[PDB]
Amino acid sequence: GRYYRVAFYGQGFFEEEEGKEYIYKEPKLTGLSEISQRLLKLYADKFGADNVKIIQDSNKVNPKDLDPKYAYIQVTYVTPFFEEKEIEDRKTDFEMHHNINRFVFETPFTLSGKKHGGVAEQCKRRTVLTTSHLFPYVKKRIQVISQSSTELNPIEVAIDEMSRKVSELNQLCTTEEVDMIRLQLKLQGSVSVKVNAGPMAYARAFLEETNAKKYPDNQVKLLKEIFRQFADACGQALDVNERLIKEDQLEYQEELRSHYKDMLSELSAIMNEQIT
C-alpha cells in the first residue's frame, strides 16, 4: 500500500492521540489529498470543522507555533526505508511490502532559514521513522517510537540527484522492452531542460574554476566523474531513442541531439576536458 506519517497536536482536543505520531497504511496508490481530507473530515466531526487544521510543513512540529484554539493533524507521505544491507536480502516486491517498520521522508531546507533556494544553497534532510510493530499489522496505523535523520549539503544534493539520474537513464537503456514515452520523458528532461535550472546548473555551481573553492576536493572529484557518466548515459538513451522513433519524431529527435551537443560543449569548457 501507501504509507503516511500522521501526527496529532491539540491539547484541548486530542486525548490518547495527543502528542503521538503514526504511520498510516493506505490502499495502493492512495494520494495525499485522499487521506488528508478523510482525516480532516474524521476529526472535524469530533471537534468541529472550524477547529481542525492540517500541518503541511514536514519539519518536526514545535508546539509553541500552534494556536491552542485549534487541533492540528500533520500529514506527510513516507516510503518504506531499507539500507543497502536490507535491500540485498529482500528479494521480491512482496518482501519490500512485508515485515517493515521503518519509513523515510525528505524535507527541504537552507542554512539561511529559507526552506528553498538555488542549487548552491539548497539542502535536504532525510528523516527515518520507526514504528513499534512490523507491518502488515491488524491495525491501520502503528505509533512511531523513534526517528533518525541525516542532512545533505548542496554539493551532496548535487551528487545525489545526478547519480540517481545516471542510474535511471542507464536502467531505461537496458530494459528488454523499452517504453518509448518513458525514455523520451526522462531524456528530454535531462538534455533539454527549459523550466527548471538544468543539470548544468550543478556543474556551474560546483565544478567551475572561477568559483571560490568551497567543497572538499574529493567531493568535487566525484561530482565530476558522475557528470562524465551522465553525459555518457544521455548519449546512450539518445541513441536508443533513435532506433525507436517513427518518422513523426525525426525533427524532435534532432532537436534533442542539438541540445545534448550544446550541453556537452558547455560541460567541456567547465571541466577543461573534451566530453564526448
Binding site: 495502493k28 494520494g31 489529498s33 539548497q122 518513458r182 528530454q188 531542460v193 523550466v195 546548473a201
Partner: protein, 177 residues
Amino acid sequence: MQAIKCVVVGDGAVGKTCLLISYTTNAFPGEYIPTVFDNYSANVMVDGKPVNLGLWDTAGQEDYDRLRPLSYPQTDVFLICFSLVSPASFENVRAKWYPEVRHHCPNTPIILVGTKLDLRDDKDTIEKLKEKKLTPITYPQGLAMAKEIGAVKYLECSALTQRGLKTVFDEAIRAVL
C-alpha cells in the same frame, strides 16, 4: 503498464510546475524537493486500474514558441492551464494555446485547467487584482471558455489545498482510455 503522454501548456507563472511536482511526488507544495530536471511521471489508480502518466512540463513564454511543438508528436491528451486569478493567462487560452494545439494536433483531447483556486477567494489577491482593474475568473467564465475551445473537461484546482488535484489527472487519463 500502459504509458500515456500528456502535455501541459500555458503561460508562465500560472503554477504548472508546482502542480505537477506536488501531484507526482505526493507532497504539499511547500515541501517539494527542488529538481533541476523537467517533466514528471506518476502511477494513477483510475477506475480500479494502475496506469503510468508521463507529464510534459513545457515553457510557455514567447521565446519558446518555435520549438515547443516538437514536444507534441505522440501526445494522448493536452492540459491547457491558466490561472484563475490571472485574467491575462485566461485570454491566452483563446489567443494562443487553443490555436497552437489544434494547429498541430487536430483531434487530441484537450482538458482546460483553472489553477490556483484557493486565491480566487483570497482577499489580498482580490485587492491586488482590483488595483489593476481586474478580477478573478469565475467558474461560469471558465466553463464558457471550455465550451468555446471544445475541451472535453473543465477543471479547477489548487496545489496548496489539494482540492481538485486528484481529479485533473484522473480525467487526463479518462480522456485517453
